[PDB]
Subunit: 120 residues, 4 copies
Amino acid sequence: AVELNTFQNIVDAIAEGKRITFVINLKKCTSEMPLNSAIVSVTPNAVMVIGDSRVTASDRHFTLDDPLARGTPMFDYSKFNLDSEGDASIKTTVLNASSYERLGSYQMNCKLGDGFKVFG
Amino acid sequence: AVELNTFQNIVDAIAEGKRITFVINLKKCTSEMPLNSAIVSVTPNAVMVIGDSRVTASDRHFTLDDPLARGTPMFDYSKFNLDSEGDASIKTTVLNASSYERLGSYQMNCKLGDGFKVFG
Amino acid sequence: AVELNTFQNIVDAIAEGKRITFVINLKKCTSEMPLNSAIVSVTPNAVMVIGDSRVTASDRHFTLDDPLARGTPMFDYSKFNLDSEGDASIKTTVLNASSYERLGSYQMNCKLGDGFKVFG
Amino acid sequence: AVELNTFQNIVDAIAEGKRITFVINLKKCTSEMPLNSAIVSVTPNAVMVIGDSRVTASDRHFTLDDPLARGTPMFDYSKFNLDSEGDASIKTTVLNASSYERLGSYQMNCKLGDGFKVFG
């Protein structure tokens, strides 16, 4: 696995059966809420290329650490979207694990190669 | 990991402990209602060879983005089947994540090496 | 990843941070009920060595295919146990995915290197 | 994948997209209640580096084998934390799988390279 620098490199790696890893540097991404400086790595078992213009994936992450309700069982659901221009977003939706009631959501935006890196 | 071109290549890769990845090119698969052109990659953590005649695997994928109920918590359950003649099918069943009620299902059919590719 | 032939090889692979894959050949395994000839491969993301005498792992597998209730959402929970003498067992407990009520269970027994193979 | 000996090695491996494995030797860790000698290996699909000072990850592990309620469906939720001085903790919270009610929790504390090892 190496860094996949370009959108075409990523599309090619998916078409060739490689498992993709997203690495996100939050301080290099823009958000409405302040995000503490962190690096976040996620490797979903599934990923899609939409029309040769978009790469999408998601991850439902179980936690008891979510700020919106510390100590309560929740899923942090993150949707990853990357377009052919290098513009990336991560939208995280916070769900009560027992009921599936939505507690909140927030979004970040980054650029490929900068705040949003992809490996495969 | 390389492309597993024949059914025997795939059975052998399973028998040798390799983790399998399915890459599906939807525009090369037959469906009842047309799906938009997309490439879908999935690596299940489990796989079976039945007899020496079929390979089977499945994935339960959590989503808020399913057309049948956008924004609602759902599981897209996909069952993958591949026979010794190279005929592949993917049956997706859409389930409400909190209740497990079925919301719909649909099926694609593909040919190994054409719309349906396998890596290990 | 190569075949881990001996119990010590497997323990060593775990201690060295390798991810383990179990390949089970059901026809080489003994069970109370008949099992159709199948090869089953599973790679859990967690595994344990108890004392220096047992290796254990498990996998909760979501399905709609289970014989005990075809078409109903279920988890096939498999518990894998391997002792230092090479005696392996897999106990599968079938659970309603919605309620967690137990629908049934079955067990197979195998020998390491024969019906139960391990890779890492 | 090799052993990641220092905190900087681990942070560098995450930042380069490598999937991380935690290997815990319980007998080299300190706990409130003594834990039986076991080696435990876990590979989470996500990990974070907080500031340049902490690495964190978690795993929600389904089991029927938990001492607190043997035979009952449960999630052993383990939160891993490692600081820049090499001090590691694993906090495990035991949850009823159907209801999410907390049944108990316990914690172990270890040192990087001693009881707590990391591979990538």
